[PDB]
Design a protein around this ligand. Structure first.
Ligand SMILES: CC(=O)SCCNC(=O)CCNC(=O)[C@H](O)C(C)(C)COP(=O)(O)OP(=O)(O)OC[C@H]1O[C@@H](n2cnc3c(N)ncnc32)[C@H](O)[C@@H]1OP(=O)(O)O
Ligand SMILES: CC(=O)SCCNC(=O)CCNC(=O)[C@H](O)C(C)(C)COP(=O)(O)OP(=O)(O)OC[C@H]1O[C@@H](n2cnc3c(N)ncnc32)[C@H](O)[C@@H]1OP(=O)(O)O
Lengths: 377, 377
């Protein structure tokens, strides 16, 4: 069975606490994106087997199996399944991997693989934090801050502050170029809020420049700053993962075929390097080399780790994050894996490429990757 | 690729608050079962791709991606992935479905599909409960209590109090018969506690009888009682899900082959009927009928719903929960799906049967099922 991505939708992404989505509960935000996806495809949600929702902190407003809450809030029929999946920042990419496996098993033909984070309304870390006392004593790197891991990569992989800032300039310039060309509009579901309808991304900072960035304070006692870190973000993203036969029968435009998937573990103290081994695994599984990949969506958790991974894999920077990356677009942890996988698929179709990879790092030392191919191949 | 279950281990299951595992954090409990599984198989955990841990309330001591915390606490290498999956009571059966799909994708050869719940230390429901205000107003059945759903099944499916109590008598008698024959020992990993080593299940009530059960108070204003409900329970269970080639190469005894998997949604107000449609789906996908199934593990969330499902599917009660069911064994929500799937596999091998099904209901109106086959077929 050929497994494809045949739809991609997301909310605008906004800053936590200070942006336009602070009043929207994450279950309602996710439900709006689920509804917007099936409406853009003119697809009866009764045809869906299951909704798998990535969420890094699935508690409080993100609790009670937010996949199923969001499905009911979207008015989807009770016949669907729903399950919530936490692999921190990679959650909704693992939702794609889950769905792709069920398609291959013949355990249903059509799935939503989605994610959500309201970093406003469920702050990163959750409530009632309770680290394991034995690991905290014997293996403290398990609970290392993300910023310290970013400094560890900057030091050990030799990514200077100025190199990090150059990536922030390019991420924002590419995001602005894409936004101004209308190239972010089709993937967006506008969201209704008390202040009105939100249709545009909020984290992009046009005219980001080296001189302004050099004035910022270090965020973590070293090279990294707020500008070279993904911001705290609210957002949701959703993909239709289905058999190729299902997509063709319902007249859906196929963005890409899923050719290979992977997870890989790494040292937690340098968790930002997760993408290297996860990318090498999809390449090996696909029978491809890095030189075969037209474009990559590598999540910009921090410039230090994104650059370090790009260099280690031998990637051309001109093939990275074509319409901007998370330093500009934002990073609502549970939602990002669906966004970068869907965006990689939509970009592969838009550019007429053959292969794409979406990949990202994960707290606790992991990486995930997805290798996409043009469905014609 | 042939996907098999080649190992099954679990802690003893104990009552929440009053049983023998109250002092054991759920991450440590899960880590002990992960270690016990690979040790019983003499299997290097460096060979594992990923740990997928089911957990119904993954917050507080169950937070921070308990799959990965448990993996590190078990001393497993950083190269493994870990992800936490919430489909309430079906969480760790969906972990099996996830792993089986990754095996079929060629995305690794060996996985742990596990679950944990410490209903002592993370009470059912979580902390900071925040139901969706629109669903609470327009669709209150989404948040219906499990007991009310059990009464709704008892009424609508005509399962009398005495019929419910007859299932409690049989569940405990079968659990006692199995325990006294040594038939629960091989699946158990003993747990070290402040009070000493815990090796035996704690929820079994030998001599459960109709006269004593008839004296109990209704638990939910109707027919159901504490004795005809699964208890609040602490426990963890873990399966090795791998390719048949992997199992053969590492000399592992194959308990069963995974032949079909399913999820299905249903009305939340009668969520206990989830197993009917999930079982019909695995039967359809396997090309089998109910008369082809040697044995079933149908989780005993409540006698009312277990009986109603058994009758609707046309199952012989003598083929159900051979070594006891959850009224006697207990039901630590995140752990149960791994336990009943692993137990069904171990029972299929022990009895020399051809086919088994493991199936259960899920809060919010869902069911999950797994159809197992003898690997020789
Ligand atoms: C494993 C993974 O995937 S990591 C994912 C998990 N997520 C994280 O780790 C979150 C990472 N980010 C963070 O923790 C936070 O964003 C931090 C700590 C880095 C920074 O937080 P804050 O200090 O609140 O940032 P804030 O938005 O206030 O920015 C600080 C300053 O930089 C400025 N700034 C930020 N970006 C830019 C830019 N592109 N150009 C110019 N100025 C900028 C801000 O405007 C602000 O200026 P001000 O003080 O004059 O108002
Ligand atoms: C969707 C799903 O999968 S549902 C899964 C989610 N889990 C749940 O819904 C939990 C279901 N169970 C519960 O909520 C609780 O166990 C309840 C509310 C039903 C009962 O809770 P409690 O009243 O604390 O039960 P408790 O253990 O105290 O039992 C009450 C009495 O019945 C007795 N009893 C229980 N089982 C038996 C039995 N087999 N034989 C005789 N007496 C019994 C107890 O000993 C106790 O007697 P006592 O008052 O003399 O001490």
């Amino acid at each position: 069975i050929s497994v494809v991505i045949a739809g991609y939708a997301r909310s605008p992404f906004h800053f936590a606490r200070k942006g336009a989505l602070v009043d929207i509960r994450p279950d309602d935000l996710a439900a709006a994106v689920l509804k917007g996806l099936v409406e853009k495809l003119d697809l009866d949600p009764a045809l869906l087997e299951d909704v798998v929702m990535g969420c890094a902190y699935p508690e409080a407003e993100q609790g009670m199996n937010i996949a199923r809450i969001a499905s009911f809030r979207a008015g989807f029929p009770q016949s669907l399944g729903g399950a919530t999946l936490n692999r921190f920042s990679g959650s909704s990419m693992s939702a794609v991997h889950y769905a792709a496996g069920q398609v291959l098993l013949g355990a249903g033909e059509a799935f939503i693989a989605a994610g959500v984070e309201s970093m406003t309304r469920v702050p990163m870390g959750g409530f009632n934090l309770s680290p394991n006392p034995a690991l905290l004593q014997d293996y403290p790197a398990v609970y290392m801050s993300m910023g310290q891991t970013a400094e560890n990569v900057a030091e050990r992989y030799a990514v200077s502050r100025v190199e990090q800032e150059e990536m922030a300039v390019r991420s924002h310039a590419k995001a602005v170029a894409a936004r101004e060309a209308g190239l972010l509009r089709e993937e967006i579901v506008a969201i209704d809020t008390p202040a009105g309808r939100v249709a545009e991304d909020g984290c992009i900072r046009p005219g980001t420049n080296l001189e302004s960035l050099a004035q910022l304070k270090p965020a973590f006692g070293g090279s990294v700053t707020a500008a070279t870190s993904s911001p705290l973000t609210d957002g949701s993203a959703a993909l239709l993962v289905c058999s190729e036969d299902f997509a063709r029968r319902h007249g859906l435009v196929i963005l890409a075929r899923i050719k290979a998937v992977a997870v890989a573990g790494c040292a937690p103290e340098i968790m930002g390097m997760g993408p290297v081994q996860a990318t090498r695994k999809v390449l090996q599984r696909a029978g491809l080399g890095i030189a075969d990949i037209d474009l990559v969506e590598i999540n910009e958790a921090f410039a230090s780790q994104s650059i370090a991974c790009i260099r280690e894999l031998g990637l051309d920077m001109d093939r990275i994050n074509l319409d901007g990356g998370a330093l500009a677009i934002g990073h609502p942890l549970g939602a990002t894996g669906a966004r970068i996988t869907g965006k990689a698929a939509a970009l592969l179709r838009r550019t007429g490429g053959r292969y794409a990879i979406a990949t990202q790092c994960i707290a606790g030392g992991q990486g995930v990757a997805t290798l996409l191919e043009a469905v014609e191949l």
